[PDB]
Amino acid sequence: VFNATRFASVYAWNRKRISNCVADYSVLYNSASFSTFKCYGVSPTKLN
Amino acid sequence: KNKCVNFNFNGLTGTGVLTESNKKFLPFQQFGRDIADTTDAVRDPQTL
Amino acid sequence: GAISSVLNDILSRLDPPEAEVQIDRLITGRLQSLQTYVTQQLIRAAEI
Numbered sequence: 565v566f567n568a569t570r571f572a573s574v575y576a577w578n579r580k581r582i583s584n585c586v587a588d589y590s591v592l593y594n595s596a597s598f599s600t601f602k603c604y605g606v607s608p609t610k611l612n
Numbered sequence: 613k614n615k616c617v618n619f620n621f622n623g624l625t626g627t628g629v630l631t632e633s634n635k636k637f638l639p640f641q642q643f644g645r646d647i648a649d650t651t652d653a654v655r656d657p658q659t660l
Numbered sequence: 661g662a663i664s665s666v667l668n669d670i671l672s673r674l675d676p677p678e679a680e681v682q683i684d685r686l687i688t689g690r691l692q693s694l695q696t697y698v699t700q701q702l703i704r705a706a707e708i
C-alpha cells in the first residue's frame with residue numbers, strides 16, 4: 565500500500581483491507597519519509 | 613493463574629487473578645461480561 | 661463524551677496530553693454521578 569507504483573485518484577480512492585497479520589508500526593513512525601503523520605483518536609507510539 | 617497480575621489479552625488490559633473457570637462459552641464467544649458491562653471472563657488468545 | 665467508557669482503554673490508547681482531556685471528561689461525569697447518588701441517599705436517609 566505504501567510503495568505501490570500508482571495511487572488512485574481521490575474520487576475513486578483505493579481501499580485495502582489489512583487483516584490476519586502482525587503489524588509493526590515502529591518502522592512507519594520512525595521513518596522521516598512522511599510530512600503528515602497524524603493519528604486521530606489513538607497515539608502513534610501506542611500502536612505497537 | 614491465581615495471582616494478581618497485570619494481564620493483557622489482545623489489547624484488553626486489566627488487573628486481577630485468572631482462574632480456571634467453568635463458564636460454558638459457545639465456540640464463538642470470546643469473553644464474558646457482568647452487569648456492570650466490564651470484562652469478567654476471557655479466552656486465552658493462544659488457547660481456547 | 662470521551663472516546664471510551666473504559667479508563668484503561670484510554671490510558672493504553674492515548675499519549676498523556678490527550679489522555680488528560682479524555683480522563684477529565686470521564687472524571688467529571690463519574691464525579692457528578694457520585695454527587696447525585698450521595699444527595700439522593702442523604703434525602704432518603706433523612707426520610708428513613
Ligand SMILES: *[C@@H]1O[C@H](CO)[C@@H](O)[C@H](O)[C@H]1NC(C)=O
Nearest residue numbers: 586639655656657658659660
Ligand atoms: C499457536 O497457537 C495455536 C492456537 O490455535 C496453538 O494450537 C499452537 O500450539 C501455538 N503454537 C505456538 C508455537 O505457540
